[PDB]
From a paper:
Among the [name]-[name]-2 proteins, the spike (S) protein, which consists of an N-terminal S1 subunit and a C-terminal S2 subunit, is critical for the recognition of host cell receptors and serves as the key determinant of host specificity for CoVs. The C-terminal domain of the S1 subunit, also known as the receptor binding domain (RBD), binds to the human [name] 2 (hACE2), the receptor for [name]-[name] and the human coronavirus NL-63 (5–9). Bats are considered as the reservoir host animals of [name]-[name]-2, and several [name]-[name]-2-related CoVs have been identified from bats. Here, we report that [name] (RBD) binds to bACE2-Rm with lower affinity than that to human [name] receptor (hACE2).
Complex proteins of [name]-[name]-2 RBD and bACE2-Rm were prepared, with the bACE2-Rm proteins obtained fromin vitro refolding of the inclusion bodies expressed in E. coli cells and set up for crystal screening. The [name]-[name]-2 RBD/bACE2-Rm complex structure was determined at a resolution of 3.2 Å. The complex structure of [name]-[name]-2 RBD with bACE2-Rm showed that the RBD binds to bACE2-Rm with its external subdomain composed of large polypeptide loops with two small β-strands located distally, cradling the core subdomain. The binding of the [name]-[name]-2 RBD to bACE2-Rm is distributed into two patches, with Patch 1 located on the N-terminal α1 and α2, and Patch 2 located on a conformational surface consisting of residues from α1, a β-hairpin constituted by β3 and β4, and a small distal helix. Overall, the complex buried a surface area comparable to that of hACE2, 1773 Å2 vs. 1761 Å2, respectively. In the Patch 1 interaction network, residues from α1 (E24, K27, D30, and K31) and α2 (Y83) of bACE2-Rm formed a hydrogen bond network with amino acids (Y473, A475, E484, N487, and Y489) from the long extending loop connecting the two short β-strands of the external domain of the [name]-[name]-2 RBD. In Patch 2, amino acids (Y449, G496, N501, G502, and Y505) from the extending loop of the external domain of the [name]-[name]-2 RBD formed multiple hydrogen bonds with residues from α1 (E37, D38, Y41, and E42), K353 from the β-hairpin, and K330 from the small external helix. Superimposition of the α1 and α2 of bACE2-Rm and hACE2 from the two complexes, which are the primary regions responsible for the interaction with [name]-[name]-2 RBD, yielded an RMSD of 0.753 over 739 Cα atoms, indicating that the overall topology of the two complexes resemble each other. Within the interface with the [name]-[name]-2 RBD, Y41 and E42 of bACE2-Rm play a central role, while hACE2 carries Y41 and Q42 in the corresponding region. Structural analysis revealed that the Y41 and E42 of bACE2-Rm, which are involved in the Patch 2 interaction network, play critical roles in the formation of the hydrogen-bond interaction network with [name]-[name]-2 RBD.
Residue numbers in the entry:
A (entry chain A): 20 to 726
B (entry chain B): 333 to 527
Write the structure that this text describes.
C-alpha cells in the first residue's frame, strides 16, 4: 500500500537528514563562534550538501499521493516535504532570482547616507543611522536620515523588488498557490479532524478582525503619544493629523520604545533597572543563566544538559575571535542545544537570557518528534514562548525574591502605568505597523496594486491603518517598504503579529493555572508545577498536530483571541482615556507636514477624459517640475541676488490624481528640511507664469493654481 | 581453572556493528562475575532470571558474550520483549532470557570530529529477527512491488545506514558499547563454574 511506501521512505530520509543538517549546523556554529574564511567555506559546503539532499527528497516525496494515506502524523511529514523547497523554476530564472536576493541584502547591509554640508561623512544604517533615529530629538536631522535612507538605498531596490515579486509569483504559482503571499500563509493551513480546518484565507480574515479590536487601544495610545510629542515638536505635529513617519523612535517606526523619554507618564519616578544591583552583588554570565535554569526547573521543566553548558558561547571571547553575537538559540540537532549570545551583566540581557533558554526549552520538548515535526506549531509559537518567560521574570515580585530588590520596595500605581506604557510602545505600537506591512505585500503579490500605484497605496495605508504620514512625498521611484530588513531579505512579517497575540493568550492561561490573583501584568509563573506541566504538554507536541488543537489544550480556545492582550492593558487603557479627555482621539488621513506649504495645481481637461494625445504622463511632470525650478531659480536671482540652483529633484509633487490634479512644494537644493515658503513660491510663479503656460500650450484658465 | 578472557570482550580495540554483532564463546575457565557487577565503568548492568548479587557461585556449560555498538536511545531495546529498529532488525533477545545486559558510554573512543560513520545498523527487514539471530546480508530492500533487481532507487533502499557519531552529540545520540552475557545450561559437563 502507498502508506508503507511513504513510511519506509521517511524512515530513510530521517536516518540521513538528521546528520546532514547536524554537520550543517555544526559548520555554521563554527562560523558564528569564530568568523573566518575557512568557516564561511565549511559552512557553504555543508549548506549546499544539505539543500541538494532536501531537493532530492522533496522530488522523491512528490510522487507519494496524499489522498490515499489514512494516518495523520505521517501525512504532515510529507506535506512539509512536498510543500517546501522544490524546484519549479528554470535554471536561468532561478539564477536570476538568486542574484536579485543577494543584491538586495548587500545593498541594505552596505548602503550609506552622506551629509548635506559634508559629503565625505557618509553613514551606514548600523550603527550610524540606527543611533540617530533612536536617540535624536532634532527634527531636521531625523528627516535627513529618514529621507536619505529612502532615496540613496530604497530607490536602488525598486527595480530589483519589481523583478523579485514577479519571479516569486511565477515560482509560487508553480507550487499551485495563488501568489507568493498564498505561499507564505500556508504555515497556518492545518487539517483538523474532529473539527473544521484552518485555511490560508482564514488567516487574513482573523488578522483584519484582530486589528479592528486593537484599533481602540491603539487610537488612544496614538493620541497620547501625539499630544506628548507636541511638547518637543511644537510646530511640526498637528494635534488632529497623522504622525510624521520619522519621529517614531527608529528609521521605520516599527517600535515606539525609543519615545519613552518623551512620553513617560511620570518622569520623576524611574523605571526599575536591576543592573546596578547585579553588578554590586558580583553577578556574572553564569549566574544569569543558572538563575534562568533555576526558574525553568522551578516550573517542573528540565534543567539544561552539560552539553549546553560545555559547548555554548555565553560571552564574547578572548584572543580576537570575530563572532556574530546577536542572541540566538541553536537546536543543532542530535540533542545538541546551545546558546550564542554576548551576554553582559544588565537587566536587558537578563530577560533576553530567559527568552533564549525559553527557545531551548521548546527545542528540548519536541526533540522526541520526527525531524520534520521538530518545530513550533506555527511560525508564531517560538518567539511567543520566548517572550512569555520574559514577562513573568521582569516583575518586581520575581526580582524581590531574587536578592535584586529590597524587601522594603513598594509597587505604586504611578510606576505601573510607566511600565504598562513602556510595554505598549513596543508591544502595541508595532501591531498596526506589522499588520499594514504584510497586508501591503499580500496585496502586491496578489496583483491588487499596480507598480505605478505602489507608493501611492503604501502611504494611504500608512495614514489610514497606522496613522503616520510621510514627511516628504515619495513617487514610484522609491521603494520605502524595502527599507526594512525583513522586506528586503525575503522574510515573513506576520510572525511578529501572531506571536504577540499567542504570547498573551499563553500568559493569561498560565497565570490562571498558577492561581494568580490581581492584575495580569504582575503575574509570575515561578514555582508553579501545575502551570509548567500544561506548558510542557504544548511544547512537546511540536508541529505534529493542528496548531488550533495545540493552542486549544492550553488556552481552551481553538481560535486566535486578542482578548488577553487587551485584558493585559486595561490598566493603561483606562488611564489613557482619562488622560485623553482634553485632546483628540483619532487622526486626519489627509493632513501632511508639507501640505499647508504646497500649491494645488489643476491639469486642464482639454478633452473630456481619456483622450490621450494630451493628458500628461511622467515625462510632462518632469518638464513641469523643471519649469518650476527655473521660475524659482530666476526669482531668487532677480529678487534676492542669490544663486540657488533648484532642480526637478527639489520640486515635490503630492496628492497625485490621474492627470487631473496634484500639489507641489519646493525645498532648498541640498537641504530637504528647509521648505521655500508658499507666498514666495506664488510670487516666483506669477513672475514667470507666462513662461510656463507657453511650454504646455495652456491659457491661464486651463493651468490654474488655486490662489 | 584459568580466568575467563573477559578482557578480550570488554577491552577490545574496536567493537562490532550492531547488525553484525559479535559473539565470543567462553568455556573451561573460572569467572568472577562480581568484578563486572561491582565496576563503576558501566552505565547499565541489568540481569534477567539470574541475580547479579553473589551468583558467581554457579556453574554453566557455556557462557556467550555478545558485543556491539548503538546510540544511547537504543540501549533500552537490549532487553526481553522490546521493540524498535534495533530489537526487531539487529539484535533480538528472547522473552525467557537467562543472562545480563552490560553497557557503557563510549563517546571518548567511538566519536570523531567530522563524525565516525563506521558503525552501521539495519533500517529495513522483511520480518523481525528470531532471538540471537544475525543478518549480515546486504540485499537491496524492496518496499514497493516493482522488482528492485539489486539496485537502490525509488521504493528500493539499501538496508544498512550509518551511525553519525559526533563527539558534540547529546547523550541519546552518543555511542554506547554493549556486552550481553548469555548463560547456557545443557545436560552437559558445565565447565565454567567460577568460585
Ligand atoms: Zn527568540
Amino acid at each position: 500500500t502507498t502508506e508503507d511506501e511513504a513510511k519506509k521512505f521517511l524512515d530513510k530520509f530521517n536516518s540521513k537528514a538528521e546528520d546532514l543538517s547536524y554537520e550543517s549546523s555544526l559548520a555554521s556554529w563554527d562560523y558564528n563562534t569564530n568568523i573566518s574564511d575557512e568557516n564561511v567555506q565549511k559552512m557553504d559546503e555543508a549548506g549546499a550538501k544539505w539543500s541538494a539532499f532536501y531537493e532530492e527528497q522533496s522530488k522523491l516525496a512528490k510522487n507519494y499521493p496524499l489522498e490515499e494515506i489514512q494516518n495523520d502524523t505521517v501525512k504532515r511529514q510529507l506535506q512539509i516535504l512536498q510543500q517546501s523547497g522544490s524546484p519549479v523554476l528554470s535554471e536561468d530564472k532561478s539564477k536570476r532570482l538568486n542574484s536579485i536576493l543577494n543584491a538586495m541584502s548587500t545593498i541594505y547591509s552596505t548602503g550609506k547616507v552622506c551629509k548635506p554640508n559634508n559629503p565625505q561623512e557618509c553613514l551606514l544604517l548600523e550603527p550610524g543611522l540606527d543611533n540617530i533615529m533612536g536617540t535624536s530629538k532634532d527634527y531636521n536631522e531625523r528627516l535627513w536620515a529618514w529621507e536619505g535612507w529612502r532615496a540613496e538605498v530604497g530607490k536602488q531596490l525598486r527595480p530589483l523588488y519589481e523583478e523579485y515579486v514577479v519571479l516569486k509569483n511565477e515560482m509560487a504559482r508553480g507550487y499551485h498557490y495563488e501568489d507568493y503571499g498564498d505561499y507564505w500563509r500556508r504555515d497556518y493551513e492545518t487539517e483538523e479532524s474532529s473539527g473544521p480546518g484552518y485555511s490560508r484565507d482564514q488567516l487574513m480574515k482573523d488578522v483584519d478582525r484582530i486589528f479592528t479590536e486593537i484599533k481602540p487601544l491603539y487610537e488612544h495610545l496614538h493620541a497620547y503619544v501625539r499630544a506628548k510629542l507636541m511638547d518637543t515638536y511644537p510646530l511640526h505635529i498637528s494635534p488632529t493629523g497623522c504622525l510624521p513617519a520619522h519621529l517614531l523612535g527608529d528609521m521605520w517606526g516599527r517600535f515606539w520604545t525609543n519615545l519613552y523619554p518623551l512620553t513617560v507618564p511620570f518622569g520623576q519616578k524611574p523605571n526599575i533597572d536591576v543592573t546596578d544591583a547585579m553588578l554590586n552583588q558580583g553577578w556574572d554570565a553564569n549566574r544569569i543563566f543558572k538563575e534562568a535554569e533555576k526558574f525553568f526547573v522551578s516550573v517542573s521543566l528540565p534543567k539544561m544538559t552539560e552539553g549546553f553548558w560545555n559547548k555554548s558561547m555565553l560571552t564574547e571571547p578572548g584572543d580576537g575571535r570575530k563572532v556574530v553575537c546577536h542572541p540566538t538559540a541553536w537546536d543543532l540537532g542530535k540533542g545538541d542545544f546551545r546558546i550564542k549570545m554576548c551576554t553582559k551583566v544588565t537587566m536587558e540581557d537578563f530577560l533576553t537570557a530567559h527568552h533564549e533558554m525559553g527557545h531551548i526549552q521548546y527545542d528540548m520538548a519536541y526533540a522526541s518528534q520526527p525531524y520534520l515535526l521538530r518545530n513550533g506549531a506555527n511560525e508564531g509559537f517560538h518567539e511567543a514562548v520566548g517572550e512569555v518567560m520574559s514577562l513573568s521574570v521582569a516583575t518586581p515580585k520575581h526580582l524581590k525574591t531574587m536578592g535584586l530588590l529590597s524587601p522594603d520596595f513598594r509597587e505604586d500605581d504611578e510606576t505601573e502605568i510607566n511600565f504598562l506604557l513602556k510595554q505598549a510602545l513596543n508591544i502595541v505600537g508595532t501591531l498596526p505597523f506589522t499588520y499594514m506591512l504584510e497586508k501591503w505585500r499580500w496585496m502586491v503579490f496578489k496583483g491588487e496594486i499596480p507598480k505605478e500605484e505602489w507608493m501611492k497605496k503604501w502611504w494611504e495605508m500608512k495614514r489610514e491603518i497606522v496613522g503616520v504620514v510621510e514627511p516628504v512625498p515619495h513617487d514610484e521611484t522609491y521603494c520605502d517598504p524595502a527599507s526594512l530588513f525583513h522586506v528586503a531579505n525575503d522574510y515573513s512579517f506576520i510572525r511578529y503579529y501572531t506571536r504577540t497575540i499567542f504570547e498573551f493568550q499563553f500568559h493569561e492561561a498560565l497565570c490562571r493555572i498558577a492561581q494568580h490573583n490581581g492584575p495580569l501584568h504582575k503575574c509570575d509563573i515561578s514555582n508553579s508545577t501545575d502551570a509548567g506541566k500544561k506548558l510542557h504538554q504544548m511544547l512537546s507536541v511540536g508541529k505534529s498536530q493542528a496548531w488550533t488543537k495545540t493552542l486549544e489544550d492550553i488556552v481552551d480556545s481553538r481560535n486566535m483571541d486578542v482578548g488577553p492582550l487587551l485584558r493585559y492593558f486595561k490598566p493603561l487603557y483606562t488611564w489613557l482615556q482619562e488622560q485623553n479627555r482634553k485632546s483628540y482621539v483619532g487622526w486626519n488621513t489627509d493632513w501632511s507636514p508639507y501640505a499647508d506649504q504646497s500649491i494645488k495645481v489643476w491639469i486642464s481637461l482639454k478633452s473630456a477624459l481619456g483622450e490621450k494625445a494630451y493628458e500628461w504622463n511622467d515625462n510632462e511632470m518632469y518638464l513641469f517640475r523643471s519649469s518650476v525650478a527655473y521660475a524659482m531659480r530666476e526669482y531668487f536671482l532677480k529678487t534676492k541676488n542669490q544663486t540657488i540652483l533648484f532642480g526637478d529633484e527639489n520640486v515635490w509633487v503630492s496628492n497625485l490624481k490621474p492627470r487631473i490634479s496634484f500639489n507641489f512644494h519646493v525645498t532648498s537644493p541640498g537641504n530637504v528640511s528647509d521648505i521655500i515658503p508658499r507666498p514666495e513660491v506664488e510670487g516666483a510663479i506669477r513672475m514667470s507664469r507666462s513662461r510656463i503656460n507657453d511650454a504646455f500650450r495652456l491659457d491661464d484658465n486651463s493651468l490654474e493654481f488655486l490662489g | 581453572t584459568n580466568l575467563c578472557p573477559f578482557g578480550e570482550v570488554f577491552n577490545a580495540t574496536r567493537f562490532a556493528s550492531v547488525y553484525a554483532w559479535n559473539r565470543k564463546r567462553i568455556s573451561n575457565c573460572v569467572a568472577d562475575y562480581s568484578v563486572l557487577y561491582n565496576s563503576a565503568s558501566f552505565s547499565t548492568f541489568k540481569c534477567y532470571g539470574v541475580s547479579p548479587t553473589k551468583l558467581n557461585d554457579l556453574c554453566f556449560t557455556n557462557v556467550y558474550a555478545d558485543s556491539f555498538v548503538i546510540r544511547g536511545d537504543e540501549v533500552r531495546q537490549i532487553a526481553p520483549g522490546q521493540t524498535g529498529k534495533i530489537a526487531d532488525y539487529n539484535y533480538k533477545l528472547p522473552d525467557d532470557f537467562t543472562g545480563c545486559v552490560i553497557a557503557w558510554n563510549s563517546n571518548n573512543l567511538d566519536s570523531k570530529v567530522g563524525g565516525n560513520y563506521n558503525y552501521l545498523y539495519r533500517l529495513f527487514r522483511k520480518s523481525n529477527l528470531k532471538p540471537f539471530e544475525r543478518d549480515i546480508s546486504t540485499e537491496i530492500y524492496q518496499a514497493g512491488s516493482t522488482p528492485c533487481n539489486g539496485v537502490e532507487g525509488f521504493n528500493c533502499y539499501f538496508p544498512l545506514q550509518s551511525y553519525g557519531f559526533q563527539p558534540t552529540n547529546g547523550v541519546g545520540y552518543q555511542p554506547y558499547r554493549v556486552v550481553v552475557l548469555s548463560f547456557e545450561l545443557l545436560h552437559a559437563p558445565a565447565t565454567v563454574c567460577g568460585p
